[PDB]
Design a protein around this motif. Structure first.
Motif, mmCIF file in Angstrom:
data_model
loop_
_atom_site.group_PDB
_atom_site.id
_atom_site.type_symbol
_atom_site.label_atom_id
_atom_site.label_comp_id
_atom_site.label_asym_id
_atom_site.label_seq_id
_atom_site.Cartn_x
_atom_site.Cartn_y
_atom_site.Cartn_z
ATOM 1 N N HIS B 163 0.742 -1.278 0.162
ATOM 2 C CA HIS B 163 -0.025 -0.017 -0.109
ATOM 3 C C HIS B 163 0.857 1.218 0.075
ATOM 4 N N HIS B 220 0.684 -3.003 7.411
ATOM 5 C CA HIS B 220 -0.085 -3.254 6.246
ATOM 6 C C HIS B 220 -0.243 -1.932 5.304
ATOM 7 N N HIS B 283 -6.102 -1.642 6.965
ATOM 8 C CA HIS B 283 -6.485 -0.275 5.564
ATOM 9 C C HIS B 283 -6.602 0.869 6.622
ATOM 10 N N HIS B 497 -6.143 -6.499 -4.177
ATOM 11 C CA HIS B 497 -5.901 -4.990 -4.475
ATOM 12 C C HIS B 497 -5.379 -4.709 -6.055
HETATM 13 FE FE LIG Z 1 -4.250 -4.548 1.912
#
Ligand SMILES: [Fe+2]
Ligand SMILES: NCC[C@@H](O)c1cccc(OCC2CCC(F)(F)CC2)c1
Ligand SMILES: NCC[C@@H](O)c1cccc(OCC2CCC(F)(F)CC2)c1
Ligand SMILES: CCCCCCCCCCCCCCCC(=O)O
Ligand SMILES: CCCCCCCCCCCCCCCC(=O)O
Ligand SMILES: [Fe+2]
Lengths: 505, 503
Positions: B163, B220, B283, B497
């Motif tokens: 990410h 993450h 997230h 994703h």
């Molecule tokens: Fe993720």
């Protein structure tokens, strides 16, 4: 969007009034339900100064007992000052004689206030106005005459008792108070027996909760009761007994303890050593408590933070203009309705995991290696500096039991300005609000033949000081949707009231 | 209220598929927007066993790169396995060669480059990634594997998240565990006139300290604003002391969550000790500045138990009654808004510093100078997660915003698409029986005036008796009303994703 009160009408909540010699007839608009027969009895401050000597705090003004009587669609209003030692000695000496919560008076010893401005509740065939001290005041619910002062210390080992006793359907009264190592004692007052002796003389301590600090008890305003369990929430608001001075001066915040939750077995009269722990909040009002498959559901009106909310309730601050009232509340604890779920069955095999296996909640309870159970709430209601407070339910039929509906007073930066209904299962809300109208705690009255939870009305006392308006009225709302059913208007001011009850006749 | 999945169609999310030799034409129902021109690229596991040797965990299956191409209201679907060391060596030796997240390989440390999680742009290039030091350059048009890149050849990190934040000029920010233990922010600059590989100009811009000298937290994702970097240090710890990655994770019971801010432009860690109760975080939704407060919107899991414990394939493939029973003691998902004060005045010790008019989030300054945070809850459903969050990223990433889109997880099974107004807490839902969607990705209308003028794209598995087994779903971003589907006659496994590449 944010509701504003620039006209400052809320100041009338904190203005001295005179008692009446006899009841006034109220002008009815709409239709008072013909099944509504009885008395709305409510307590609040009515005298906010003795001559040139002011009371400083919201909880200092001298106890005023209010009554709205309902009969065949007609309404009367009556009010009398309670003849406490605090009131009588003040009228005698024409000065402040007894120290109040936030006002020092300027030896027999420490003269504890009996200013019973908070609530009224039944014991046997009798009614008692109370504050949170050892002194409660027997009152006549028909004439509003003061009958006698009762010292609970003459009967049981407590330093005080809350203004929020639980009343079982048979008339049994449960209460909690600080006691002596410091602890918290549950007092039980039995129902009136055939022998007809005063039930207070049969008062006993049924169970004791331990204290987090050997020398500093937490402030306790209310507690939870189910058929099988007593729930006590120990908050970081502490009383420093190692303390010219008033009661407010003795309060301090413990920064590190957070909130400790405590359960006791009601029937076996035993404290359960489950170490329930969560983040810091102030708690005044439990909404309701109930059992669901060996979990306790604990619905609370919380204030997020450890700073004492009472710091924001000095009369000087509540009487300020609206822009200043909003500014004063900027750094206050945030109000939030929270559902906590306490597991009764703790299995060591589930260490490190969420014990709340109920299908209908997001509340969690994590069993730690040190055997503390860390709780996270399900949030039911959250508005920026908009409190759902002074909660009421269909208490007689749903108190201590699975339930759906709560009614509340909406506080806008601590100013009461709306009435709220909350579905605690769906989080749906209903609101009643009128500009320049400041209501009181809503009290639910069931239709006597109701099978549904919300089949009835809520009663609220509303202050409405407009240029061309009646200064106050009794508001009757349909409990289904908070739609207006009637008002009973009076031509005199009514100051703030805290708590009360509907006495059916 | 509870939606049930007794037919067990969600099992197809975790079933091996074959790659295609060339793109298939998809059957369109409704109307594909004529302004929608480009490629939806998504990564997920596609191969869940090598012969008789099974992969055990959701994050173990071999990386499959998916592409839906949109042009003039027509759609093609293409997929190719990424030719990682993990995949190539598995096909060569006809066994599991490289240890995956939750699967030990049996015969130094060969770290997995199984890039099954996400794909992102660096300069003119696209990289599939997992969360290790290895990212895989891929051709976004042909889905061919170009090269393996070792970030350790360029910067001091042991790995980097799937990410990264991408600024509008093409600057890439990421975070990873490092030594002296700490967490490093990596910055990859935009492609310059000199046209040299931007990864060769990678640098560490700031370092976050670690709560435990020897145990870094699992990370993450992270938050980015114009002026600030936000890092959330969770109680999910990596214990560096026939093991797989899962075996190294443990929960710290006492630390709760530590939140960290760094000044992005001055490249300095800010020593504000933000503290709150324990949760898992995967997230970040979005982060923004509001009058010297950071607004931090998070997809949280309440508790310190690692949520990944519930994502073994054996458990996700069970019948519906067993899937529900397995989730009974799991952490509860909850969307939370935290508000971090930047200006800490000692005079306000013991008080709530969050003076903003539009939030119930609090921040209490303690005497030990820790700042205790309470969230504003935006969304909370019993074992119903608002997860894989997406926003109008290009225009509202790091900025004041109103709308988030999410995948709804029902006891960890994806079964609905969600839109959340983070100001009013109003929600919209799209759901169809026996239909299991993917992360929704937002694409703006080219003439958009509002934040939610556009569509969301989701890949849906629908293995009903008499139905097309999978489809590309297009919803109107305004109300999540269906605009079109592009149906294919083959299964599509779970994807995590991706991105929409405009052309
Ligand atoms: Fe993720
Ligand atoms: N209504 C809130 C406070 C109000 O009822 C009040 C008024 C006067 C005194 C007071 O004392 C609280 C409590 C402090 C601890 C105690 F043990 F002394 C028993 C009494 C409380
Ligand atoms: N998103 C699920 C996790 C998945 O991407 C994955 C697969 C394989 C390894 C992995 O490692 C996570 C972590 C392990 C420790 C580390 F230091 F290497 C930094 C990266 C993570
Ligand atoms: C109707 C009161 C309006 C004035 C301000 C009220 C602020 C409420 C704060 C939380 C509850 C306070 C305690 C309830 C009253 C009592 O039982 O003594
Ligand atoms: C589409 C996924 C469905 C299967 C189960 C999903 C469970 C998700 C749990 C929370 C998020 C986990 C991390 C996101 C995945 C990733 O980025 O690698
Ligand atoms: Fe009260």
């Amino acid at each position: 969007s944010q509701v504003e009160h620039p006209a400052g009408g809320y100041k009338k909540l904190f203005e001295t009034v005179e008692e009446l010699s006899s009841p006034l007839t109220a002008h009815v608009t709409g239709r008072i339900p013909l099944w509504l027969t009885g008395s709305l009895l409510r307590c609040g401050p009515g005298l906010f100064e003795v001559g040139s000597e002011p009371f400083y705090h919201l909880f200092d003004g001298q106890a005023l007992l209010h009554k709205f009587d309902f009969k065949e669609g007609h309404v009367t209003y009556h009010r009398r000052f309670i003849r406490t030692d605090a009131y009588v000695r003040a009228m005698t000496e024409k000065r402040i004689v007894i120290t109040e919560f936030g006002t020092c008076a300027f030896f027999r010893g420490v003269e504890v206030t009996d200013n019973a401005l908070v609530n009224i509740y039944p014991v046997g065939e009798d009614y008692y106005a109370c504050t949170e001290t050892n002194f409660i005041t027997k009152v006549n619910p028909e004439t509003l005459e003061t009958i006698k002062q009762v010292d609970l210390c003459n009967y049981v080992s407590v330093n005080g008792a809350t203004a929020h006793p639980h009343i079982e359907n048979d008339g049994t009264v449960y209460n909690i108070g600080n006691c002596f190592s410091i602890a918290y004692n549950i007092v039980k007052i039995p129902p009136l027996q055939a022998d007809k002796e005063d039930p207070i003389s049969k008062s006993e301590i049924v169970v004791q909760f331990p204290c987090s600090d050997r020398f500093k008890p937490s402030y306790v305003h209310s507690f939870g009761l189910t058929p099988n369990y007593i729930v006590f929430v120990e908050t970081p608001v502490k009383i420093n007994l190692f303390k010219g001075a008033n009661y407010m001066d003795c309060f301090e915040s413990n920064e590190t303890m957070g909130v400790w939750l405590h359960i006791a077995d009601k029937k076996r009269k035993k404290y359960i050593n489950n170490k329930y722990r969560t983040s810091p909040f102030n708690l005044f009002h439990h909404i309701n408590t109930y059992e669901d498959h060996e979990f306790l559901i604990v619905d609370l009106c919380c204030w997020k933070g450890f700073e004492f909310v009472y710091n924001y309730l000095y009369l000087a601050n509540l009487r300020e203009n609206w822009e200043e009232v909003k500014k004063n509340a900027r750094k206050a604890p945030q109000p939030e309705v929270r559902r906590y779920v306490l597991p009764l069955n703790i299995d060591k095999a589930d260490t490190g995991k969420n014990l709340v296996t109920l299908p209908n909640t997001t509340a969690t309870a994590i069993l730690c290696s040190d055997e503390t159970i860390w709780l996270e709430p399900e949030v039911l209601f959250s508005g920026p500096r908009q409190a759902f407070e002074f909660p009421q339910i269909n208490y007689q039929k749903y108190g201590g039991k699975p339930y759906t509906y709560a009614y509340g007073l909406g506080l806008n930066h601590f100013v009461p300005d709306r009435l709220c209904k909350l579905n605690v299962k769906t989080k749906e809300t209903w609101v009643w609000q009128e500009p320049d109208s400041y209501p009181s705690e809503p009290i639910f009255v069931s239709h006597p033949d109701a099978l549904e939870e919300d089949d009835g009305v809520v009663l609220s006392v509303v202050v409405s000081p407009g240029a061309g308006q009646k200064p106050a009225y009794l508001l009757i709302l349909n409990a289904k949707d908070l739609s207006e059913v009637a008002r009973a208007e009076v031509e005199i001011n009514i100051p703030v009231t805290f708590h009360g009850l509907f006495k059916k006749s």
